[PDB]
Symmetry: C2
C-alpha cells in the first residue's frame, strides 16, 4: 500500500544505514513502477540518491571505480555539491571539486582502459593521484553523513514519502 | 531473486526488456547491490540498452546527456556486446551520437546544471535530432532481435547466477 517500504525502526538507524535504507526504498519503488528517470523523486531525494552512489562507489573502489563504472557525469555535476552546501554540508563538496579536476585530466584514459578490460583495482594503482581524495572523502563522510542524517530527521516528511515535498 | 510475471515470455519486445530489467533493479534495490554485482555481463547489456531506450524515447539523446548517463551509455561494452549478438543498427547510432556528445555534451550538461530545461536543450541542440530519429528506427528492428536472443537464452536472462 505505501510507495516506500521502510522498516518500523528506520528513524533509529545510524547515518549511513539511514541513507542507504531510504535510497534503497526509493529505488525499489522506481524499479517496481518502471520509473527509470526517477521522476517521482524530489530534488532533495535526488540529492540523497546521488550522495549514496558517491559513497558506495568510493568506499568500494575509490573515485577510480566511480569513474570507470560510468558515474562521472552523474556525480561530478553542480547540483549535488550545491545542494549539500545549501544544507551546510561543505566537506564532501570540497572533495568533489578536487576530484573533479583529476577526473577532467585522467577520466577519459581511465574509462578507455576500463573498456579494454583493465580491472578497477589495477586502475586504482595506475592512477594513485586519486588516493589522497579517496582518503579525504572517507574523513569528510563520517561528519557529513551525520549532518545529512540531522537534515533528514528535521525534514522527515520530505524524505520518507513520495510526493509530500 | 527476481519477481517476474507468470506470462513474461508472451511480452512484446520492449515490455519484455523493461520487465526483465525492472526485476533486476528491484532485486538490487532490495539487497543494496548498487554496483549490480549480481548481474552477468549479458544482464548488464540488457540494463544499459534499457536505459538508452528510456532516455532517448522520453527526451532524446539530449536528455540522456543532461541527466548524466553519457559515461555509462557511450562506452564500448554496450555497443560491442550488441554486435556479438548480431545487433548492429543501434551500435551504429551510438557511435555517431557519441561523436556529437564529445562535441556538445559539456555544454548541454553545464546548461542543465544551471536550470535549462531538457525540452529547451533538445531544441538548442538540434544536431541530435537526426540521431534520435535514427535510434527510433534502429530500435524498432533491434529490440525484436534482442527479444529473440533473450528467448533463445531464457534461463541466462530470467534468473540470477545461472
Amino acid at each position: 500500500m505505501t510507495a516506500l517500504t521502510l522498516p518500523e525502526d528506520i528513524r533509529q538507524q545510524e547515518p549511513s544505514a539511514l541513507l542507504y535504507t531510504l535510497v534503497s526504498a526509493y529505488l525499489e519503488h522506481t524499479a517496481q513502477t518502471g520509473d527509470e528517470s526517477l521522476s517521482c523523486l524530489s530534488d532533495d531525494q535526488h540529492t540523497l540518491t546521488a550522495f549514496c552512489y558517491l559513497d558506495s562507489q568510493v568506499e568500494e573502489g575509490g573515485f577510480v571505480q566511480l569513474i570507470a563504472s560510468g558515474y562521472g557525469e552523474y556525480i561530478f555535476r553542480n547540483p549535488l555539491a550545491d545542494s549539500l552546501r545549501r544544507w551546510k554540508i561543505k566537506a564532501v563538496p570540497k572533495v568533489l571539486d578536487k576530484a573533479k579536476a583529476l577526473y577532467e585530466q585522467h577520466g577519459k584514459t581511465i574509462e578507455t582502459l576500463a573498456d579494454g578490460g583493465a580491472d578497477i583495482p589495477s586502475l586504482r594503482k595506475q592512477f594513485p593521484e586519486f588516493e589522497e581524495w579517496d582518503g579525504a572523502y572517507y574523513e569528510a563522510a563520517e561528519q557529513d553523513l551525520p549532518l545529512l542524517a540531522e537534515h533528514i530527521q528535521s525534514n522527515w516528511e520530505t524524505f520518507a514519502h513520495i510526493g509530500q515535498a
